[PDB]
Amino acid sequence: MHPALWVSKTGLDAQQTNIATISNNLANASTVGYKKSRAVFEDLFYQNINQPGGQSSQNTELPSGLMLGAGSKVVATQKVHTHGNAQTTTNALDMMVEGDGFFQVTLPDGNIGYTRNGQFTLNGEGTLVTSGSGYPVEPEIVIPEDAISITVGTDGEVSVRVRGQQDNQVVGQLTITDFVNPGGLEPIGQNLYLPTGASGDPQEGVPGLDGLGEIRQSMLEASNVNVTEELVNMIEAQRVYEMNSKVISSVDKMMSFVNQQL
Amino acid sequence: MHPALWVSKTGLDAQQTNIATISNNLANASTVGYKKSRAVFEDLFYQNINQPGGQSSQNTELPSGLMLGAGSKVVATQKVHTHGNAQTTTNALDMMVEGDGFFQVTLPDGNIGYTRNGQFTLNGEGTLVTSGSGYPVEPEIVIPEDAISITVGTDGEVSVRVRGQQDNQVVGQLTITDFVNPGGLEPIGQNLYLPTGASGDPQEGVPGLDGLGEIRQSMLEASNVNVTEELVNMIEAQRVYEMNSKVISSVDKMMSFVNQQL
Amino acid sequence: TLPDGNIGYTRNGQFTLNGEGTLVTSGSGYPVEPEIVIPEDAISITVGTDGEVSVRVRGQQDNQVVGQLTITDFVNPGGLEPIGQNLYLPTGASGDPQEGVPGLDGLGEIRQSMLEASNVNVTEELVNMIEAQRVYEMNSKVISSVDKMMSFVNQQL
Amino acid sequence: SVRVRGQQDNQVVGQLTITDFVNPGGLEPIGQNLYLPTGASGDPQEGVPGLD
Amino acid sequence: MHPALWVSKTGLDAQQTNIATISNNLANASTVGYKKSRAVFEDLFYQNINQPGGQSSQNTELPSGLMLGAGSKVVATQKVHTHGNAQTTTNALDMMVEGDGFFQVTLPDGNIGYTRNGQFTLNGEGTLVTSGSGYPVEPEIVIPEDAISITVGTDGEVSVRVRGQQDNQVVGQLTITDFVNPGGLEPIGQNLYLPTGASGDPQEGVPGLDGLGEIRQSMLEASNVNVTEELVNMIEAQRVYEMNSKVISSVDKMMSFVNQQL
Amino acid sequence: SYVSLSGLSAAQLDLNTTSNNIANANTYGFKESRAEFADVYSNSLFTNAKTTPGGGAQASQVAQQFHEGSSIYTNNPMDLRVSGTGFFAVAKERLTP
């Protein structure tokens, strides 16, 4: 009914999405290998009442035209893929990618899901699986019941030590996948990513050559969320949200006054 | 029917445009690289009943005449292109222009657009693009898959570090374009501008010479809207809007009285 | 400077630049007299109290003067003919336009980054509307009474 | 003038002109907000709309 | 609409700049060689309704007149160029100017910038540069690769020791620049100043002589901000801010009342 | 409010640097880090100067001060110390130098 009513609706919508993004970051303040997200704001189209640069008289043009905006919106949720701090643990089956790279696990549908989480465990058959839903890790790493200790090298070589045998028994070789644009991956939950069109082709190789990161045994990657940043962004978003509520309230009072008078 | 009806009606239209501008400024209170706007008011023409300065006797002229105003309108929306504050970020792909200058991107139709938002990213091919619709940045900055870090110099020289090689390899050079009258640009939304007649010829160059601004990596430019100004301007606009309705309400009562009496 | 050629006079100070760098108004785009052209090598713009417009240039101390603003006064400002667009035209009763530096010979001073709000008294206009409405309605009573009197005479006489 | 995408600066497609009369009351109204010049209306004075 | 609205707006604008001035002083409490700013308030022009000292009648005059002020504004943000405290450090490349003077560096554009921060380092060629953006220090000081230690004297003479050789081989001479009015310098960020008209002509010379300060090696100059003063000034600036909002709040209620009644 | 956010971020970075320094108190060969900051000030053609409320506080870089640290004694020949300026060279792969 009124242009300022629709413009502030877009402002309220953007701030609700911004707060929801912050609420998701603070919820995942202890999740292993979680990458924080930031909402990206952009203004909407401008209505063209007076054209800037239109020739009003010869040798004279409008220095600035009457262009009314349509509000603002949140256009994207950017996953900030900066490295998180390392947690030192006594577990031997939890790993970490020091640098670029994603662990690859086999989803039930058949595809491969890429994860930054390193919390792994064993299934009944001894296959190295995720500590959550239990997805097998690509390539499969089966630890025989003849082993007394598991050591995973920097280059991803999984080796176990056999009792009564003075020699490491190599039982696997982990390969990690890097993406040119990891922020373009589609988060599907459960600390898993799926490749997308803008993510780029998956490039797989040995973990430590050709720009890939290193596998760190007995170490976990913390989330990169900054609780100080999220709370300050929470306060700012709450005020901007209340800014557009006053504009709607003023427009609401304006229309009520006109109804009574006009 | 009555001059006060037409005179005050332009006042109602003038304030609605003003309130729409204020709402748009408050909606983009978190938009990165947003420039606030102010409605430019001017009065309409005057009906020349008696010409001031017209000779009455022959030695006595009219010191002030009867000239009736027609109202007021918002003739232009001036964008104040003053810099916003700087937000420090850990992301290495988002930049800020300290000083005059505009980043240039490639619109889908082929024309070159100009922006102040610095929130960039990479696409599937590694080219530096925007974080919204994904438009490429001119000149194209393709990040090699062998890079381990990204550094953007003050002079716009994008450099990356490669393992096994000292003397970081330069992969591109960003250029910014300044405008004599940035307020004369046509805002097409999506934090983008288009050159116009009064905008001026796009002058391109290295970011930091000949008056051009400097590129600050890992830093963002906040919106320059003043939340205090917009809310107080909302107070002024609302009251003047209601008072112009008082005249129209009074004129309506006057005509109702005349219909019953005359 | 008006498109026809004559010089118009205004009190609104919302100015800007055009593509050529000349100082123009923010509305229709009329250049401000005298022409003030801002160089593209300028990093800031400062307007002195006396109208001396200067710009700062990197690599050079003592910011370079780019022009000089002149303001015009009138003995009787009420005699100006308003042509709209916040502009006035001199008339016979306005007086001969006296020009000079803004701050000498009784002229005002140019305050930068500042605007002059309207001087209307919103409360008075609402009171004036009340008085004007009632007198307008009361004059209708006399015409209505005269109408009924002539109706009575036509019926009777 | 018209604003054309892909081209900086508005291109001019033409220029309107108006006519002034010495005695507008001498015109002959023919309806539809239209007037016909007559003998007493005067001589149609064309020109640039805003000068003279 | 109402004079008290515009007068109180200038009060809110003035206090916002004063609070923003203090908020920057708090942010740069740990910046080496930072000089605090002060906000200077001054009232605006006065509306001359009745001229004080007019002529009420012969042999009498108006003692005081009716002149309404237009509000207040922050006319300048004055830099307080007093010396901060001294920090002792183990690094031999950070120096402190004990007294008047500024270090000089070469900006990328070509002009010479002036800094009070002493955190310097070396580049790959051994030339002394700053520890931030890496600007070379004027005059260029090149530390030979055969140097075993670096000593900078009071008079700015940089000397190094070569193994197997007595005496200090002088590698260069540091020169500091003084200004008559250091408050007139234009800060361009990165702890750098550019000389303006109000600053005066730069005067160079050897440190410790001709009135200039002395170069104290392995020492730094902390910021001169007084957190006690900033916090106290913050409270006062907030109280003036809230009492200005009361007038706008009061005028809003008055204008609302007149709309309902008149 | 953004300047206060910059100040908070700078202080938090300094806290992180100090905490990292303290945590590495026991590791051998570590060099302490120092946090350096610079003022942030940004002006346009259209912004009134004279009045320059600064742009806050900007972190410059985390330094890696290389002052010599003290020595302990193990009485083990396989432990070596470089007295003065110098570094050891260690290759990830035996073959490639």
UniProtKB/TrEMBL annotation, chain D:
| Localization of this protein | Bacterial flagellum basal body
Q: How does it assemble?
A: The basal body constitutes a major portion of the flagellar organelle and consists of four rings (L,P,S, and M) mounted on a central rod. The rod consists of about 26 subunits of FlgG in the distal portion, and FlgB, FlgC and FlgF are thought to build up the proximal portion of the rod with about 6 subunits each.
To which protein family does this belong?
Answer: Belongs to the flagella basal body rod proteins family.
**What name appears for this protein in its UniProt entry?**
Flagellar basal-body rod protein FlgG
User: What organism does this protein naturally occur in?
Assistant: Vibrio alginolyticus
Q: Tell me the gene name.
A: flgG
Q: Which residues of the intact protein are shown?
A: 159 to 210 of 262
Automatic annotation (TrEMBL), chain F:
> Where the shown chain sits in the full protein?
2 to 98 of 437
Q: Where is it localised?
A: Bacterial flagellum basal body
Q: What gene name is listed for this protein?
A: flgE
Question: The Flagellar basal body rod protein N-terminal domain covers which part of the protein?
Answer: 2-31
Q: Which organism is it from?
A: Vibrio alginolyticus
Q: What does this protein do?
A: A flexible structure which links the flagellar filament to the drive apparatus in the basal body.
Record-given protein name: Flagellar hook protein FlgE
Q: Which family does it belong to?
A: Belongs to the flagella basal body rod proteins family.
